[PDB]
Symmetry: D2
């Protein structure tokens, strides 16, 4: 019936239009309260207890802020209340498809358990939004508030996942192109979802955040680029834009890709793999499903949250023992031991289909060191991490349009050379982390010898503690000294 106010630690008092409230107060949406934003990060950063729910509220809020500011500054855009509401809904709903421990689920588990399926949290969000709409009688409520469900649900879905297949969108015409750059920006990745997670993750992790999203909003316009209306930034802000991505990278460096956080996600993933044959999730009409198969019945996926972790942990079924045991090790803090980090040198990259063979390479290395123990490929974990600016090898700022103070409608491009010589010369790189599942002193020592030798053989970068953990290995490599 009426609008609600929600007090958020990041944004303060957020006003929710009654339709938004209607969408939020569904099992499908409330489900997100039981899925941590940073998954295993919480097991390293105790302040990171926040879940996808509050993040989603923040995203909807910011989407609303940006679209409203745009409309207010430029009424000639003909942004309607319908547009605002659809953008807010998209913002609210683009996190619906996330599984247990967020990125652990779609980044590690699903690719291993369902390697044939090309699953994404975006598609999950579309399906789950469709299921929310259909299971909660949302359409009549949308019509009640002036929305046209066919068009507008199309538009929302497209905001989340892109064109459901020349102007490729069906939800809105070309003159409203800019609206697709708010919730999930496919062009350059500058969107409100990022802003909310910068602020929220920072607030909870104990890290200060360098990015001023409000400033950005106050310096954003719509201009015509390539006969298309796009969101443009004030030229002045180019530095701040570069910094934004820097921030992202920093956050991945300090927290998101923290080696222990990652190894914990890995262990939880192993536990899930070992529990997958014995865990039942009742889906549609009593039809049972698995952790790996919950993602193809939305009624089952709705009940697939962080809860799984605890179910496994609290089980008494002998068939779950192994899985249980793994989780229990996490509780005792008997984790796989981090052995080190290294990088490719020069031009060479590491292809995905090679990942599987990496622990064999390490185990096959021949360090000239005396060792009683002997490790095997299955004792090693090799985690390859692609760090980039969101557009693989490309500089996303080259895909941003700017405007000058004297011609606010004239879109211009700004090159990296026009800003600073102190900026990154590359926008993508790979970090290779090595862990060992054997945790005793001698095993960790051997693992270090194998690892550093492996780095030398592949002509990879010298590990930072190389001279310390493998003093007999490192001065074989002239390139390292």
């Amino acid at each position: 019936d009426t609008m609600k106010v929600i007090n958020d630690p990041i944004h303060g008092h957020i006003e929710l239009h009654p339709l938004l409230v209607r969408i939020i107060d569904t099992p499908q949406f409330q489900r997100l309260r039981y899925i941590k934003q940073l998954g295993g990060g919480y097991y390293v950063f105790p302040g990171a207890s926040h879940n996808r729910f509050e993040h989603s509220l923040g995203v909807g809020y910011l989407a609303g802020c940006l679209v409203h500011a745009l409309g207010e500054k430029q009424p000639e855009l003909q942004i309607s209340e319908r547009d605002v509401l659809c953008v807010q809904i998209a913002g609210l709903c683009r996190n619906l498809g996330h599984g247990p421990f967020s990125h652990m689920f779609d980044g590690r588990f699903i690719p291993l358990a369902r390697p044939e399926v090309k699953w994404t949290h975006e598609q999950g969000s579309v399906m789950m939004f469709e299921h929310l709409i259909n299971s909660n009688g949302i359409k009549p409520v949308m019509e009640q508030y002036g929305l046209i469900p066919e068009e507008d649900i199309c538009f929302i879905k497209e905001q989340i996942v892109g064109p459901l297949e020349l102007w490729p969108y069906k939800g809105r015409p070309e003159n409203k192109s800019f609206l697709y750059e708010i919730v999930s920006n496919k062009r350059n990745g500058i969107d409100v979802d990022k802003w909310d997670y910068f602020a929220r993750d920072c607030h909870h992790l104990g890290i200060q955040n360098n990015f001023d999203y409000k400033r950005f909003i106050k310096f954003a316009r719509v201009c015509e680029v390539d006969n298309e209306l796009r969101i443009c930034a004030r030229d002045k802000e180019v530095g701040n834009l570069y910094d934004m991505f820097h921030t992202r990278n920093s956050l991945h460096r300090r927290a998101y890709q923290h080696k222990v956080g990652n190894i914990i996600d890995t262990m939880i993933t192993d536990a899930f793999l070992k529990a997958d044959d014995y865990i039942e999730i009742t889906g549609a009409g009593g039809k049972k499903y698995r952790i790996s198969t919950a993602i193809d019945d939305m009624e089952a996926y709705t009940k697939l949250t962080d809860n799984i972790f605890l179910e496994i942990l609290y089980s008494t079924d002998p068939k779950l023992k192994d899985a249980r045991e793994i989780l229990k090790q996490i509780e005792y803090r008997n984790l796989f031991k981090y052995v080190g980090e290294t990088q490719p040198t020069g031009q060479i990259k590491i292809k995905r289909e090679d990942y599987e063979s990496l622990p064999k390479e390490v185990a096959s290395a021949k360090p000239k060191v005396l060792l009683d123990v002997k490790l095997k490929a299955e004792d090693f974990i090799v985690d390859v991490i692609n760090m980039d600016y969101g557009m693989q090898e490309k500089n996303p700022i080259d895909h941003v349009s700017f405007y000058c103070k004297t011609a606010p409608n004239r879109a211009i491009r700004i090159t990296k050379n026009q800003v600073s010589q102190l900026l990154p010369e590359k926008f993508a790189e790979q970090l290779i982390r090595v862990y060992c599942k054997k945790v005793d002193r001698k095993s960790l020592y051997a693992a270090r010898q194998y690892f550093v030798q492996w780095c030398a053989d592949r002509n990879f970068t010298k590990p930072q503690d190389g001279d310390v953990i493998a003093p007999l290995i490192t001065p074989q490599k002239k390139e390292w000294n």
Copy 2:
């Protein structure tokens, strides 16, 4: 094994001595990651996702800070490393006893389920600590770090719950009395646990803290009082002390006793009660326990967390339907409707024994108005809340010792009218909230009539929205105009 550093958003970088690390990395301690600090409050303040774990870490840290500060200011106290470690363990482990949704469990659920016991989270903490130590071989580690297991474990337990059974403490002599004022202060309620939850809860709720604990720590000495060495605050800090309690009250007013948060705690408690006979928790020996009986076996209690909620929410068994459905109504936000709030006048108390009778009273009222429906006692909930400065009717500052800059070692007293005339004249009061389980317009209107009439009959305070929700009724009471 070495010290570990943990980054906390409240305290920053916290150092953990390896013994503390050993204690934390047990299932008994890690359990606290799965119990929300503010419970149902998370459903009103979406920022309040924080759990008892991070709060406990915070408490241990602050305990350490206080004892170290005292030690460094006054070497004559003979505060030892052992003392410091024991105080830190006491701070870390004094939240071990909380159950699912924290205070929902010891404050609502347990007194209803098993009204014949006197369960407290303190006792739970002692039992849980005992269980953690015994189940994890912590004693030999304790002596590895120069602790004496018998008397130090006694000392820790005593810091948690007070005298187990004249100087009543067996863990420490009276010349170390001040140590017992740090973790859980029975004398005046001024301890580090409060400080942590002030800062942390404020940080997550999105409301701001006003108490400066670091300042207090700065101006804290140990001075002699009534045969005892006790913690004394510098005189001019007295204002700040009153304010401290004022903050606590404020926190209860805005957040901890939020009408909706409380009614959600209520609905969840009811769901647990209706689920109690069917949820089995496997404890020691493989023996089966229930939610209400897990507190009798620490092995089962270890597995008693917020997960229950989801276990009830995700269930399929008919015997759980009535529980399950309740939780589902929380997801659809079909909550019991808040009817209103009133207070008793004079020095008129409402003892606990009368609580259960209050719903009947409201329904037995005679509103001289048309009513389309008649409500029964079982349609009403009367939640009565005691707001006080932590020592029932007493002024806790009357139990604080102070010192002046002219004589640092000399304890003194400061009376209330020696500070300000603007302070509360009382230090305890009662709030009466009334809800209606029937939600329809007509039943809610009727409920408002019944309620206001019930306020008039018992000469309770006039509901702020009295003239608006029952204009045919408030004229009868001439004291209300």
Copy 3:
């Protein structure tokens, strides 16, 4: 001309309409950059470097925010862009009248150097605003942006100082009455000026602000009260409102009325007095003015800032020696020694005309102790502090109008009994601070004896350190022990 954006640490990015910019970029306005918000408080709280300027910007911003909120929720109020601009201007300009060290000037210096005049910073703001307008050709700029200079200028002035003397305002009719409640609220003291100095002062002092003005703004409506459209708060907010004043009180208790900050304001005022005959400030037509007379010519007052402190301090003129030596004594931190604080009892109210008679009394007391050093009137300083809720003895909340969610257009009243019984019973009290200019040890002892015996004789409250600084005096007064 276009609007400008200013980044403020409190409010973030605030927009300024070109008219406000034109008003700001004048010598009369920029003047405020050189006057400390907290005067001598900076010599106690090193973070409190902030000046009246930035505060003024904040006040204008918040005024704009509140009026926009009101207008966007209730279009039936017909709030024009003119109204918004005029409210913003009043917000910006209501600090123009402040003198050197802010409240030290109108609160100490002026009343002592010119006892016959009735000078307030508000009237000063009016005169300075008029001077700004006339000196800077602002009227046609106002016209350029749609303002009607005569009534709008009257309106702005009325918002600042009140009626320039049935409905007593010429600027706006009664149906825009609520507009007069935003910048300077004569009705209950709840205005945006308070909100800015709460947030800002707390930011700089290192004390934390617990009042949430954004929340208040979100919950504010305009309702009919005795045929007058007025600003009404949501019922639920009442507690927060009480707290808002409590906060004010706290900020006075901790910082604004800090004993050393006040005695420093006293020494500065004293020095300004002793310099008043000799300092020349050139005004209109080259005519020369004093410090105490600069308030008569706005051209001279424009040049009267904190700079005076440094003129005196840096001076070499023998005629200024006496003043100079005082400021230098502040630099060496040889301040008058604080003897203590006490309060009247029962019904006593130290009236202003009796203030001068206070050092005589203290110096007169016969404490009957061994007394190797006798002291006199001009050795003592007695400062009387009136702590209240901004409406003398009255409860400001009784002058606040509320609304309920069931009938948002229906204004109601709420009494203190409808809220809490932990609230204050008095809303005004007095504090008596005694210092001694004789800083040596024996003199200090003496002054303590004098002061305590004086408190006993006047039936004042027993000083907190009483039983330490006057051991042979405090056991006499039987109502003390």
Copy 4:
């Protein structure tokens, strides 16, 4: 006399040893209250009201923190309380030499007014420190607290300015080398002064700092490096170290080198140059000094603060007209207009000796466009900014020693390719800003054409607004498109 506690908004409650207090309570130190940290920055960022005084307290506090931490973690360094006091005094006093508006004075004014002298704020701080010691009888107070003035004063001065001209330090031997790395680090620039100004400047500017100095302090050790004991950072902090410098750079781009802030510093400088003949400052023995000569007499320098600004602003002397007017144009916000920014390409670097030749070059340019007005040299201003990581063209991280977890006493080196490929390739660049003193639309158009043409002639980078301000010029430079 005893220890004092000071509440600072950045650090909270700082303890100051009585000796430090004696040093602080001097006109030479208190002088820093009247000098703004960011100078002209205040006129762009209204939050930047903070002064050198509070910053100095901050630096002393942090120096103390780092030395204490080092001493607590590593007893074998034999750090004495004498060392702690000397490092605190150095940190406290290393900003004593700053002049009016800080870096405007030593960076702009002095070089233009006294090109024949080498002047630095470091030399000024040493001089002012000696003056402080000699004017306030500090030596016997130093001796009173266990200091040895002859060697300790040398130690402090050495910490501030470096070797007074094989171990080149006299204050402390090589085994205390690490002590010189705290207050002002000549080796790599990582010192507590930076940490304080990061935190403080950010707090006041309304910018957010992502450098965690506390974390750095916790992971700092002293290890042997080349027969010295030096501060070593834990290996994995290397990323953070890079980020620290990145932060510095960011702070320079957003705030310290704000083009308007710089042009305001330039206008103030020009005003001082035009006032130098006439303003008099009375130093030792009544002798008179100019602003440019005050640095030759510490007694006069003690009176040289931001006050002169106001003096010039408030003067009636016709000889000061030209100075005064400029300041007046600052108040009216009639500033020199910003034409634009460019950068040298290739290897080319601009030396100071070429600066004055730059405005001549811009006016000597020939844009092939119809101009209505001819501009000359005096109409142009060229500001050259050097942006580096504190060590000219070098990577300061190549001058950081690290330590690994497994061998905490063994110092190692970490190269850039060992960390990230996304790091800067250069560590220095130049920014060239061009402004025009004539502010009419015509002269501005002309100036734009001149500037872009000049940029093209010297193969500089294409201005970001190039295609907009000069459409007839940018298509001529093939190197741009």
